């Protein structure tokens, strides 16, 4: 806890405002108060006279729609001196330094004599306040000129908290009274006195706009406008009673800001409505109670950490919107009521004001989710979570936050179509003051109702909405809007639910003899798409059926049809970013591949069923030693193969799937390595023999394996299964492991580091490989989108010639981090969100000082405990102590399977390791500079190929795409098994050998999969090379030069680039086509 407490303190002092700017602004607005005191009074005026008085003035009043017309504006207008007061965080001195900038709120209270009792009806109080602001602006402007401050002051209106009904004057300083360096914003709040209108008439259930439907938004606006100073007083008392209030306040505003949460209005569409004063007033409400028994949940003696923890726990578990609401008294212990108002509610009985009125239903669930997931991190003791909670901005990119994003282009956008304007109607103007508020609500209901369980959370954002407008104009002007609608377009953003996002049929109410109300809303909503169906279970239910596709999800069709039918038949709904990522995944050459969903693993299940057929065969077969078990350890068995398995598609690199065969422990195993492995081939040689006799439909052949260095007797049995799948079998025995340990012990001290590397690769294939499949295969299910993203992630590495150096397992461990460790984000639920999350992590991963350790466990045992956690951390420090720069090791990937952390990340050259981070960084920068769009994605998946010193192009004699099982094809294995090599790509093996010979001088790389990244016909592959700095320049000649060079002087040589090109050309034979140096 002490580590966190000190971490709190460092954050406060780092962000703490510099007190000098407080004096600077305090010098200014203190003088601004004097300017206000100069402003003269005014007489009673009708709308006709004030219009004439403001007719020729540069100032224009910000009348709120509907503007007062001569008939209904019979009430007069007058101005008098207000009571100037200072309000806001600056009043509480809980303010901070914000690089984007903060604001200072000053309230000018109208004298009560300017108000009648029934002025809260039909925007009566609204319009007189509007002219009151205008009269201030006129006189303030001229007085600003007289004092000569106008040179560096810019004045404009703005809407308070993006509330269209409360325009305010906003004062800034452009580059002695110049406060531009302070970066603070004086906002003049024109609010009403306390208790001018009976608050009981202003309750949410009541109405104040005659046309009856309630007006919660307007009732809050005037009532909240009349209740400012009281909440101000209410917060100081708490500030005195508990010493850690301001500290608790500043912790939340971080957490609000990093999640992109603000006090601004949410019905418009922007995510927000929970700001600092919502955050603080929840404290004060909780500090005097909050429980169902009205017991205190927070105590005044609590520290900043405890105060912050209580509200996060309070908000996470108690519901304030649907079932339950909280009541408190600002002026009486706060009590949690079980009844709910179906909207976020924090009633204040003293003021009769609901503080969560601006808080929307949809945003509230996302708030409740964010607090809960932080509470889990807050309770976490194994891992430090300070940086994630407070020092990580998730609000930068919408795609990373939100699984799917859809932009809806509304028709006739210099006003909305007559039909769409007609839908607004008069009743909804009363409910929702602006069409933006209503239209956003319209999208949410139809989108929420249409998708239902397919999604977790939905957000509707009015892109291009402005809140500030010049002094000369009465309302905000949008270029598309034309003073009609303050937005450019609507973006529909979702948090999908992977479990049922791809359901083919949307279940509905059951059939009944009388058509029920839920069935009524059912059949009407989907219309012709609605109908009645029966199932195997015998249930008769109204349901609608969709069609799966490999290019877009089912959610694409639902929103397009749902919005068009209800919102507007002319709406254009498009999400191309999903479609490009879906297409980049290879399309398998199976029946109905196009209609198959990306979440369907049908190809994978078919593979193991064929293995199960072979599984039964091997066991009943009689051998000298009984079979202990046969363990599949393949990529397709763990659902990570880049291209899905295809029958008879033997050109695929992953076609032959490795399997581990182990027999009963025996004391007769050879004690020598070569006899042991040759004895293994003898056992496999039997397995080939009577398999051929008993099961002739299975075909078989033998191949040699050289992955393990210096163990050249390894022979693997390749079985060509009749269903059309290939399997590679290698035998595992207990004596094999200890013999390697024997070699390390006997090896000379200089040779021991080499031998342990050989042991490292052995355990990576035989021992650790078995565990890797077991966890990932089980862990893959609930993480439905992990399989597509790791496949697409693997595709991205191959395009950039990085898979040749990165082992397959490392790409999986890096790709699973957003799933096992989603904080501060959520678990990926879409292909693009997961993939961009993987790229984001690699961009910001500092692998030299920060280790990667993963808890390969299911979502909330095998979780890493404190003892295991500190042990792995101890390991990373020890390795980095010997290898600070990270030349030998770059990526430290560890888990329960791999506590050492070097098992799957050893042998990667330092150059390549920097490419993964360097490419990831630029990709993130590209997304920032240019938003996610078709052009950007095409860049993300195309290789530059220019930085490489020399580039070699290759073409295979035949196209391999068809034989790889990729739909832009063999139906049986060749009669002669020699013919398999004729239809395969050797460039991966060509590069592997050439690196080792030129290990000291060159680094060659190539595309492992040629059918996917080799063009239309899948024959074009490229070998790209790099000359190390040392051999790039001339060197003195020595026996240990270990490089192909040319003499220049009697003791000087230089690299032989031309012959290496010839050496590659002869080694490539006819495949090589061109050389670019």
């Amino acid at each position: 806890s002490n580590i966190f407490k000190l971490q709190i303190d460092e954050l406060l002092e780092q962000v703490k405002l510099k007190q000098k700017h407080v004096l600077k602004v305090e010098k200014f607005l203190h003088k601004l108060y004097d300017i206000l005191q100069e402003i003269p009074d005014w007489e009673e005026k009708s709308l006709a006279e004030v219009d004439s008085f403001f007719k020729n003035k540069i100032v224009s009043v910000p009348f709120v729609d509907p503007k007062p017309i001569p008939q209904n504006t019979n009430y007069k207008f007058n101005y008098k001196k207000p009571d100037i007061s200072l309000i806001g965080s600056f009043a509480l001195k809980a303010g901070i330094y914000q690089p984007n900038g903060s604001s200072i709120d000053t309230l000018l209270t109208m004298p009560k004599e300017l108000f009648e009792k029934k002025d809260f009806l039909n925007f009566r109080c609204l319009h007189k306040r509007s002219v009151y602001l205008a009269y201030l602006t006129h006189h303030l402007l001229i007085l600003l000129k007289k004092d000569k401050l106008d040179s560096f002051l810019q004045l404009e209106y703005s809407y308070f908290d993006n509330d269209p009904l409360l325009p305010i004057l906003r004062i800034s300083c452009s580059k002695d009274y110049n406060f531009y360096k302070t970066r603070f914003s004086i906002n003049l709040l024109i609010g009403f006195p306390y208790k001018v209108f009976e608050p009981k008439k202003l309750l949410p259930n009541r109405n104040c706009i005659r046309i009856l439907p309630a007006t919660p938004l307007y009732n809050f606006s005037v009532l909240s406008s009349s209740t400012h100073e009281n909440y101000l007083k209410y917060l100081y008392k708490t500030k005195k009673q508990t010493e850690s209030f301001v500290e608790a306040t500043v912790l939340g505003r971080l957490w609000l800001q990093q999640r992109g949460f603000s006090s601004n209005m949410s019905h418009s569409g922007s995510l927000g409505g929970f700001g600092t004063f919502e955050f603080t007033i929840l404290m004060a409400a909780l500090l005097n109670g909050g429980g169902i028994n009205s017991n205190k949940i927070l105590l005044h003696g609590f520290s900043s950490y405890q105060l912050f923890k209580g509200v996060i726990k309070y908000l996470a578990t108690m519901d304030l919107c649907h079932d339950g609401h909280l009541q408190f008294h600002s002026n009486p212990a706060s009590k949690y009521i079980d009844e709910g108002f179906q909207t976020p509610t924090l009633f204040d009985k003293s003021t009769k004001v609901n503080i969560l009125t601006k808080m929307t239903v949809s945003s509230y669930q996302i708030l409740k989710e964010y607090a809960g997931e932080t509470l889990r991190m807050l309770n976490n003791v194994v891992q430090d979570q300070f940086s994630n909670i407070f020092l990580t901005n998730i609000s930068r990119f919408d795609n990373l936050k939100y699984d799917l994003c859809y932009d809806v282009q509304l028709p006739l956008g210099n006003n909305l179509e007559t039909s769409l304007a007609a839908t607004f109607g008069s009743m909804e103007r009363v409910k929702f003051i602006t069409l933006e508020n209503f239209l956003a609500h319209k999208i949410t209901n139809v989108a929420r109702y249409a998708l239902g369980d397919r999604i977790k959370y939905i957000q509707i954002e009015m892109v291009g909405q402005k809140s500030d407008f010049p002094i000369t104009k009465r309302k905000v002007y949008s270029n598309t809007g034309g003073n009609h609608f303050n937005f450019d377009f609507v973006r529909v953003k979702l948090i999908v639910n992977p479990s049922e996002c791809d359901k083919l049929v949307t279940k509905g109410p059951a059939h009944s003899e009388t058509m029920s109300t839920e069935a009524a809303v059912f059949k009407n909503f989907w219309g012709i798409k609605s109908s009645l169906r029966r199932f195997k279970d015998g249930s008769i239910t109204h349901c609608c059926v969709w069609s799966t596709s490999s290019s877009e999800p089912i959610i694409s069709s639902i929103v397009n049809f749902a919005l068009q039918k209800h919102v507007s038949k002319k709406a254009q709904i498009s999400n191309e970013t999903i479609k490009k990522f879906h297409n980049f995944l290879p399309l398998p050459n199976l029946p109905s591949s196009a209609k198959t969903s990306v979440l369907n693993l049908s190809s994978f299940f078919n593979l193991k069923k064929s293995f199960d057929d072979l599984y039964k065969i091997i066991f009943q077969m009689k051998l000298p030693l009984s079979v202990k078990s046969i363990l599949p350890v393949g990529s397709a068995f763990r659902y990570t193969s880049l291209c899905q398995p295809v029958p008879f598609a033997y050109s695929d690199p992953d076609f032959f799937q490795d399997v581990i065969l182990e027999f009963e422990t025996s004391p007769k195993w050879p004690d020598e390595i070569t006899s042991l492995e040759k004895a293994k081939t003898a056992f496999l040689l039997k397995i080939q023999e009577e398999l051929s006799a008993n099961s002739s439909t299975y075909r078989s052949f033998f191949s040699r394996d050289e992955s393990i260095p210096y163990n050249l007797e390894i022979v693997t049995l390749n079985i060509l299964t009749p269903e059309g799948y290939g399997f590679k079998f290698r035998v595992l025995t207990e004596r094999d492991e200890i013999l390697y340990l024997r070699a390390i012990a006997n090896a000379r001290n200089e040779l021991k580091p080499e031998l342990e590397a050989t042991f490292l690769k052995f355990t990576a294939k035989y021992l650790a490989s078995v565990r890797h499949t077991r966890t990932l295969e089980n862990i893959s299910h609930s993480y439905q989108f992990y399989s597509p993203v790791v496949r697409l992630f693997k595709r991205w590495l191959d395009t950039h010639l990085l898979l040749g150096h990165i082992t397959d397992e490392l790409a999986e461990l890096i790709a699973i981090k957003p799933f096992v460790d989603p904080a501060p984000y959520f678990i990926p639920g879409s292909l693009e969100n997961g993939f961009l999350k993987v790229l984001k992590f690699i961009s910001q991963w500092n692998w030299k000082d920060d280790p990667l350790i993963l808890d390969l466990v299911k979502p909330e045992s095998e979780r890493l405990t404190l003892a295991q956690y500190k042990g792995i951390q101890m390991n990373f420090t020890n390795l980095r102590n010997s290898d600070p720069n990270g030349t030998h090791l770059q990526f430290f990937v560890a888990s329960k399977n791999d506590p050492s952390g070097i098992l799957y990340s050893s042998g990667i050259p330092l150059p390549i390791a920097t490419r993964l981070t360097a490419l990831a960084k630029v990709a993130v920068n590209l997304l920032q500079t240019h938003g996610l769009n078709q052009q950007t994605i095409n860049l993300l998946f195309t290789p530059g190929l220019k930085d490489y010193d020399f580039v070699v192009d290759l073409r295979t004699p035949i196209g391999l795409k068809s034989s790889c099982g990729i739909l832009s094809a063999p139906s049986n294995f060749p009669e002669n098994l020699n013919d398999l090599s004729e239809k395969m790509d050797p460039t991966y093996q060509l590069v592997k050998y050439l690196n080792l010979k030129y290990k000291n001088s060159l680094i060659l790389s190539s595309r492992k999969y040629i059918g996917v990244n080799g063009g239309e016909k899948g024959d074009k592959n490229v070998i790209t090379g790099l000359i190390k700095p040392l051999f790039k320049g001339a060197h003195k000649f020595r026996v240990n030069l270990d490089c192909n060079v040319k003499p220049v002087d009697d003791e000087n040589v230089i690299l032989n680039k031309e012959a290496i090109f010839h050496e590659i050309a002869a080694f490539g034979n006819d495949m090589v086509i061109n050389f670019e140096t």
Partner: peptide, 14 residues
């Protein structure tokens, strides 16, 4: 166009 990153052999990008 393409994403091209200057090759780094001193781990300086990190």
């Amino acid at each position: 166009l393409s994403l091209s990153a200057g090759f780094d052999w001193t781990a300086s990008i990190l």
